[PDB]
Assembly symmetry: C3
């Protein structure tokens, strides 16, 4: 019964839609100057096994705007499994707080925390998925362009946590994703396979122009995040996938550009695109706050 928020593929489509609509409603009240406290007396534990300041700040502010409290815990203050079983940690933290946000590396420790917690566990992000970023992205898209149904997003470069959640979102929100990767039409991806089985249109190609053509949103991420630790090697395999003005001109004229920050200008995207009129990267970043507020509210309800 507990309303965990683990991944887009573990929450029903109708509920994800309800969360998005609530995010818009709460954002409207906030921008109108309303300060409210529906979750006064609720506490969110925030466990960070790896550093993510933008995730910390966006969840912290969001919880406070709901009237709740937050407690920031590091890996050094808390590594699940170090000093006691994860079950014991989960059961004790459940006696003190009302929800637990976790940023972990591997998925398994988050799932074990959720198994034994009696309060909701929220995936702030992991190495393999990033549902909260993608909720922020879908929110941003709809704010700028209207209903996302049937639209096409084109991802440039190779997979990472954000792309994995994006293809899950294509299923849950009934849109399409074109993916231009050196891996070609043979990506071998559990996420793509799940998305296709659950309503997404996914096309995989080596060719950026083929993916971008007529697309409604062009998305990329850093060379490091996409699996190239080496700068020159990164430059090498990813330079053909760069989001530049020439690539954006192949997309729909009203296309948006998105990027889960941080970005490196001149690498995966040029200055003129990310700081140009099609970019929504800062609105996207703001929407981490507004989307995550609605996820928190959904988890805390009842």
């Amino acid at each position: 019964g507990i309303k965990h928020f683990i991944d887009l593929s573990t929450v029903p489509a109708t509920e994800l839609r309800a969360i998005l609509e609530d995010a818009k409603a709460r954002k409207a009240r906030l921008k109108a100057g309303e300060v409210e406290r529906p979750y006064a007396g609720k506490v969110l534990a925030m466990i960070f096994e790896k550093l993510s300041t933008r995730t910390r700040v966006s969840f912290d502010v969001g919880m406070r705007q709901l009237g709740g409290e937050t407690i920031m815990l590091t890996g050094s203050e808390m590594q699940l499994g170090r000093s006691e079983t994860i079950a014991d940690t989960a059961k004790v933290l459940s006696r003190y707080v009302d929800a637990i946000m976790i940023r972990t590396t591997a998925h398994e420790r988050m799932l074990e925390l959720a198994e034994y917690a009696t309060v909701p566990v929220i995936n702030a992000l992991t190495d393999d998925t990033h549902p909260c970023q993608i909720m922020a992205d879908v929110l941003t898209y709809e704010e700028h362009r209207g209903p996302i149904k049937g639209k096409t997003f084109a991802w440039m470069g190779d997979g990472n946590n954000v792309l994995h959640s994006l293809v899950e979102a294509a299923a849950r929100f009934d849109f399409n994703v074109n993916i231009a990767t050196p891996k070609g039409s043979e990506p071998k991806s559990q996420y793509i396979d799940w998305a296709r089985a659950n309503g997404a249109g996914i096309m995989s190609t080596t060719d950026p122009e083929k993916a971008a053509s007529g697309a409604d949103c062009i998305v990329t991420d850093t060379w490091v995040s996409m699996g190239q630790e080496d700068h020159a090697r990164g430059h090498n395999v990813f330079i053909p996938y760069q989001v530049n003005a020439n690539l954006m001109a192949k997309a729909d004229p009203k296309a948006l550009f998105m990027h889960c920050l941080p970005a490196h200008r001149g690498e995966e995207v040029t200055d003129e695109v990310i700081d140009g009129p099609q970019s929504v990267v800062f609105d996207e970043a703001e929407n981490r706050l507004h989307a995550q507020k609605a996820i928190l509210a959904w988890c805390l309800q009842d």
Copy 2:
């Protein structure tokens, strides 16, 4: 005049009882859904010279439920005596906050902080005593079993901060403690000596069965916490003191099992005891929050 909370042996019995009764009253209001703010505008500084996340979380949530504020400070942000005299630190922090919680190693730096502070200083725990854990334990006992007066607790293994405060509590709350330790009837303990002089019945033995027989509560802690840094050596001196089903069967049929977490199943206690029907370890953990709220309220009053 300042209401420091240093140790059970430094607060009068009647006041400790008042604190316990207030803990029950406030807990009842909380469970009934009331959110209140009697100490709005009060700030608790929390100084941790050594890591204790369960102590941090339980004090933080408790202070917030009183309507107050908390500030988390580490040893690296604050080691008493490093960059200025402790007197200077105490006097300045007293100008900013309304109470100071400290987790220190040795007692002396806590006492010097209290000497110079003009706000209450609270012993969150030290290497030598743990009054807040024992207030939580007495609360838990009475919630499950009624008045603690005249009851008998049996501790298995050797001394540590928790046992030291437990024997002080035996005096202050008029109960008995049987202690089964390799040290035998010759423990040589300042705490036992003080407790006996102040109303406690204390019996020390090498024999776990003698200590446990007919007892109302069986308590233990980790081999490391009880002075054995080596695992095999720990196993070696402490395995006869393990709390297992055979030992629990020697106690009163209504006996409780307690353990200041974290615990190591298969070492000082077996799975079947700590996860069985006599165990109250998670309620005990929850009661850190409720007991410490009442200590904070007592310190902050007037």
Copy 3:
């Protein structure tokens, strides 16, 4: 238009005066027992590239007393320029919070943050200036002695961030500073030059008695803070500049003694001065809270 608080030399005199008067007004309401929340829903990010616990605590409590929220970020959580451009950090943090306090080493990264932020940036302190400490000092002076106009402060030892802001304050609040330094009447200081051009009377001398004579406030700081990393060398160049009873007796009979903590008794000041009846060091420390509240309120207004 954005109300950054960078330095005393970047804010108009009339506004600095307004801030001081508001600090007194808000302090009076607080001491009278009023708990108010004019900036409910406002969030202050606190970026510390170098440790300063007294700065953290004083800003945190102050923001909370205004009804706002704070988020503590370290250098390791945030070093401006490490993982993305400072512009990108500024623009994203501006979407989440309402003001940004920064403690940096060098001024330049604070100024770039302020260039790109769309919320006020506040200089908590830097290696080169300390406007908030000096606002606290001027507040303290006026509370104990009345209007500061035309008074004379005497600084003993060599320059540092505090002295730099003090000489700026001499201009902005129309008072005088005598500076006794081994550098003599040839200090070569951009701050002195600016202050003189903007209304301050500044006299520089090697002779402590000449600086102290008839002064209304005697101020010093640690040997390390004044540029002597070596203790024996420090003792060596600075011992003639020590603030002791003999030096205080040369000042006006009603002179105050000030020191931005921490202090080292027996080095730059003796016990009998800092713990004696002319010392206001603890009131000065308290006034970090009250002065910084008024700076926050000024930045957050409108």
